[PDB]
A paper describes a structure:
[name]-48 is a class D SBL that uses a nucleophilic serine (Ser70) to hydrolyse β-lactams, with a proximal post-translationally carbamylated lysine (Lys73) proposed to act as the general base for both the acylation and deacylation steps of the reaction. Diazabicyclooctane (DBO) inhibitors, including avibactam and nacubactam, act on a wide range of enzymes to overcome β-lactamase-mediated resistance. Here we describe investigations on how avibactam and nacubactam inhibit [name]-48 and two variants, [name]-163 and [name]-405, with deletions in the β5–β6 loop neighbouring the active site that modify activity towards different β-lactam classes.
Nacubactam is distinguished from avibactam by an extended C2 substituent bearing a 1-aminoethoxy group. Both [name]-163 and [name]-405 have four amino acid deletions within the β5–β6 loop, including of residue Arg214. These are characterised by complementary electrostatic interactions between the DBO sulfate group and Arg250 ([name]-48 numbering) and positioning of their C2 tail groups close to the β5–β6 loop. The C2 substituent of avibactam is identically positioned in all three enzyme complexes, whereas the additional 1-aminoethoxy group of nacubactam appears more variably located across these structures. Lys73 is fully decarbamylated in all DBO-bound structures except the [name]-405 : avibactam (both chains), [name]-163 : avibactam (only in chain A) and 16 hour [name]-163 : nacubactam (both chains) complexes, where Lys73 is modelled as partially carbamylated, in dual-occupancy with a free lysine side-chain that is associated with either a water molecule or chloride ion. Leu158 appears to adopt an alternative rotamer (g−) when avibactam is bound to [name]-163 (chain B) and [name]-405 (both chains), compared to [name]-48 or chain A of the [name]-163 : avibactam complex where the t-rotamer is observed. A hydroxylamine desulfated carbamoyl-enzyme was also modelled in dual occupancy with the intact avibactam- and nacubactam-derived complexes of both [name]-163 and [name]-405. We also see evidence of desulfation in our crystal structures of [name]-163 and [name]-405 bound to both avibactam and nacubactam, indicated by negative Fo–Fc difference density around the DBO sulfate group when only the intact carbamoyl-enzyme is modelled.
Author numbering:
A (entry chain B), B (entry chain A): 21 to 261
Write the structure that this text describes.
Amino acid sequence: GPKEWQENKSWNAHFTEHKSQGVVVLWNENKQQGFTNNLKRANQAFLPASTFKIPNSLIALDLGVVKDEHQVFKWDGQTRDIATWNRDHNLITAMKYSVVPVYQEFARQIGEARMSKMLHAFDYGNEDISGNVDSFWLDGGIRISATEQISFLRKLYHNKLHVSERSQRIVKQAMLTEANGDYIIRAKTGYSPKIGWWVGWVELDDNVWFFAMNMDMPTSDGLGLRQAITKEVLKQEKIIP
Amino acid sequence: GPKEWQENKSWNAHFTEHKSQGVVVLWNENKQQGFTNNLKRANQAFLPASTFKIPNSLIALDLGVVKDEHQVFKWDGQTRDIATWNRDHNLITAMKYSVVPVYQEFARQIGEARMSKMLHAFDYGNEDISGNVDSFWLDGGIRISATEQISFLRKLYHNKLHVSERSQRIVKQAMLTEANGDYIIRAKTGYSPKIGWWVGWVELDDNVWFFAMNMDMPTSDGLGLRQAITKEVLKQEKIIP
Ligand SMILES: *C(=O)N1C[C@H](NOS(=O)(=O)O)CC[C@H]1C(N)=O
Ligand SMILES: *C(=O)N1C[C@H](NOS(=O)(=O)O)CC[C@H]1C(N)=O
Ligand SMILES: [Cl-]
């Protein structure tokens, strides 16, 4: 019989081009088949870092901590290193600019008990929120693999997570990254010390390709390699032009 | 003091450059003010043509004629002149490829009584469905002006139409045309005998600009001028780069 999961090591060339190492995992929804350059690393669990703003957003919306995608979270007046964080935001722009202080406030309002219960309900990674309620996804005990990211994203795509359909549609809107006549990408980046992520999916006319990539990220320089390397894989596989 | 609507006739140069005539209407949501090159034509009511697939989609979803954006409507097997129509479609691809026969099926299932009631609820144009329920927006009596399109789109953007929030969110998803780090465009084209349309909005980080344009279209050549002329106005006004 055909293989649910196949390894394509030729994608390693896209990492080697940049003196980097990592994994891209692709899932072809119509075929129900997955593809990766590194089967072992595809299943190793890492801190989710800013990719956690996907479940954090869902939980905040479903609990009413965030009323809708237009509600304004005012800047607290603390001048931070990332200039785009030093302004008022809504859910859309907080996702777009990956505004940590806004999501820390969401997490504090959610609280430890509800956050833990909701990650259990989501089957999210190791479901472990050990650490600070407002930083465990950056320096605490939570861990998720690339294949687990795809599983979670597939549930989100199909409105199957244990939150309202409305919360799922709002977050999928907030994940919008790029759209043209050839494809739509909904995705979220992340970076914790050691590891950069890009997770999401590519919508085509007649199929959807889910993706989850992580790579060794010693420096914030080359954060753009997350999208660049993934797009080289997508181009090689003729998913995007 | 300032007016709700201001005329900017310098935009006429974008029509003149293409030996064409028409109107662009913009609405700045933050400032609650509108701008147009021709206030008279901005209020002239025309057949909506394929821009009707916005309200038609909303009504079909809210009545359950269309269950969700993934439900497939199979090709009826009749080979029509637009090749992309000769295939199966869902709501997303039917709006992208402007598949009239799919929307005619929606309209027949909606039926005349519910169609008329819903367009009245929407305050949509002249609300006149006289003719056939599956062609009145192509060759019947319904008429809508560019400013009426703006009013309708503003209600849709704010989830204020008399249909479920869910139906409104799905249609706004289906309207997605272009997205990048600078802007998102949700919009729909149309073409009836001698008139081309483009209506929708441009989402920015801290504002939304609604737009409705129409132009004289004596031949099918120059349909791309609908977006091209609109984008020249958007660029002149520094809404997009
Ligand atoms: C999340 O991983 N973070 C917040 C912010 N996002 O940048 S990224 O999404 O482009 O990775 C900066 C990196 C990281 C953090 N340092 O908290
Ligand atoms: C809608 O106005 N129509 C359907 C189709 N779409 O073309 S457009 O959306 O690019 O204007 C062809 C034109 C028109 C029609 N002939 O019914
Ligand atoms: Cl969207």
